[PDB]
Amino acid sequence: DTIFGKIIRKEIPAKIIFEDDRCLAFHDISPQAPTHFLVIPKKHISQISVAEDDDESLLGHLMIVGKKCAADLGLNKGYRMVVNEGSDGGQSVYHVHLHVLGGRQMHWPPG
Amino acid sequence: DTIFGKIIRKEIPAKIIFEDDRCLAFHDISPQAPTHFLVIPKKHISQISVAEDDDESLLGHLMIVGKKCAADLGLNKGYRMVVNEGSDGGQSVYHVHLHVLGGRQMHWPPG
Numbered sequence: 148d149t150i151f152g153k154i155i156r157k158e159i160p161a162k163i164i165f166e167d168d169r170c171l172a173f174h175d176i177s178p179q180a181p182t183h184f185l186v187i188p189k190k191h192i193s194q195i196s197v198a199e200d201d202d203e204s205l206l207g208h209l210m211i212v213g214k215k216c217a218a219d220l221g222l223n224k225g226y227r228m229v230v231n232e233g234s235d236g237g238q239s240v241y242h243v244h245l246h247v248l249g250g251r252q253m254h255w256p257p258g
Numbered sequence: 259d260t261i262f263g264k265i266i267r268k269e270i271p272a273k274i275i276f277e278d279d280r281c282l283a284f285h286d287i288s289p290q291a292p293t294h295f296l297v298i299p300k301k302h303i304s305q306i307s308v309a310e311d312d313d314e315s316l317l318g319h320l321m322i323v324g325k326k327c328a329a330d331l332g333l334n335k336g337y338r339m340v341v342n343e344g345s346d347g348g349q350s351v352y353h354v355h356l357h358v359l360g361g362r363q364m365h366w367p368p369g
């Protein structure tokens with residue numbers, strides 16, 4: 148499985164900051180902002196380009212959970228959510244997940 | 259209302275590339291990649307930090323629609339999805355929406 152499949156299975160280390168029946172979140176190992184964490188679904192979907200219609204609620208859930216965690220972490224000034232798809236998107240781990248970055252002014256373009 | 263509220267109402271111009279009962283998509287007026295479009299929900303939510311639990315499916319829908327449009331537009335090499343929240347996130351239009359950027363290698367950090 149992937150790195151995230153292993154974190155879910157408690158095979159690869161990660162301090163978990165949120166978890167429910169459908170997802171969990173943890174800090175990015177290479178933070179690009181003072182606060183930089185990921186929200187990953189327990190269900191395995193290799194990439195968003197292959198997600199099904201029926202996964203919409205799960206995908207929206209990752210955003211609602213990212214919003215909640217951002218609040219818990221004190222990101223009252225805003226943040227940026229990001230989903231990296233495929234080679235051009237810069238995807239490294241083929242298990243769908245969402246990035247949330249804050250604690251500093253995010254720039255434009257977004258990469 | 260906002261710029262996007264007006265586009266929905268057909269008050270501000272935009273070539274619409276996709277539309278269903280719950281959202282529509284159109285190209286960004288200041289493209290940061292060869293393909294750069296937005297997916298916006300017809301329902302008004304000023305920012306994702308104020309979205310409710312009950313909006314998860316709508317939020318996931320924006321991603322599924324972004325995936326479909328990306329395929330329609332030929333982004334077979336991947337892309338990046340982005341949601342700008344608040345001042346630090348770089349948010350300009352206070353009507354929740356999703357960016358989809360492709361057609362070139364996206365860099366890291368994502369701003």
Ligand SMILES: Nc1ncnc2c1ncn2[C@@H]1O[C@H](COP(=O)(O)O)[C@@H](O)[C@H]1O
Pocket residue numbers: 150159161174175176177178231236237238239240241
């Ligand atoms: N063991 C790990 N724990 C936490 N974050 C990680 C770990 N391995 C990879 N990452 C992060 O996960 C992301 C994978 O890239 P992407 O698929 O583009 O989101 C990069 O931002 C890596 O820093």
Ligand SMILES: Nc1ncnc2c1ncn2[C@@H]1O[C@H](COP(=O)(O)O)[C@@H](O)[C@H]1O
Pocket residue numbers: 261270272285286287288289342347348349350351352
């Ligand atoms: N009239 C318009 N038509 C299309 N895109 C627009 C228009 N007005 C603003 N935008 C884009 O919408 C985005 C608003 O910023 P943000 O809230 O950070 O996504 C920027 O990328 C602008 O280029």
